[PDB]
């Protein structure tokens, strides 16, 4: 019962406003974390 996702599905999951904000915990590293 392994959770399996094909590439196309994962790509389409990016099309959600949930993804449009950074994680609060995101460290500010110059040149790495935008």
């Amino acid at each position: 019962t392994r959770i399996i996702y094909d590439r196309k599905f994962l790509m389409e999951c990016r099309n959600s406003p949930v993804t449009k904000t950074p994680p609060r915990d995101l460290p500010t590293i110059p040149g790495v974390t935008s």
């Binding site: 399996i4 950074p22 994680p23």
Partner: protein, 165 residues
């Protein structure tokens, strides 16, 4: 005054992004959506500078050979000409997160390393001597990655990678 529902697609494991120029954690996520939040707010490895590495390992597994999960472990390695690292890294981790490798618990994580004249992408597994696992990992890499068949893939134990030419 909205009326909303929210549910996210779980992953088989929690994963942690790491960075190195000392390896430091960027963050940990447990859902496809949370992954894109971290990924979309990181520079792509192609647009990276100097001698830096990204790591994406199962939560709890540090991206170091010393970690108990990486005892008796090894990795497949792909050396890439400049310009391929961003696309390959994306395809690799999407394949890892999507459980495309189908080797049970054997996967530890993935690395991409930008160097001077080339880039290197690798995926680590727990048991270097498990030939059935290392071959299945090999076969999945050639698929999910879009590399020519003559692209050389190297499998090395972690000890093979330490203190050697």
């Amino acid at each position: 005054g909205p009326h909303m529902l929210e549910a996210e697609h779980p992953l088989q494991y929690n994963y942690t992004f790491w960075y190195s120029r000392n390896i430091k954690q960027i963050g940990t996520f447990a859902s496809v959506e949370q992954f894109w939040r971290f990924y979309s707010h990181m520079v792509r490895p192609g647009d990276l500078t100097g001698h830096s590495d990204f790591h994406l390992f199962k939560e709890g597994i540090k991206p170091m050979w010393e970690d108990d999960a990486n005892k008796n472990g090894g990795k497949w390695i792909i050396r890439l000409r400049k310009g391929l690292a961003s696309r390959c890294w994306e395809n690799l981790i999407l394949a890892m997160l999507g459980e495309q490798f189908m080797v049970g618990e054997e996967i530890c994580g993935a690395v991409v390393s930008v160097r001077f004249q080339e880039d290197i992408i690798s995926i680590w597994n727990k048991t270097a001597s498990d030939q059935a696992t290392t071959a299945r990992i090999r076969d999945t890499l050639r698929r999910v990655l879009n590399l020519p068949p003559n692209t050389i893939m190297e499998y090395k134990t972690h000890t093979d990678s330490i203190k050697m030419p």
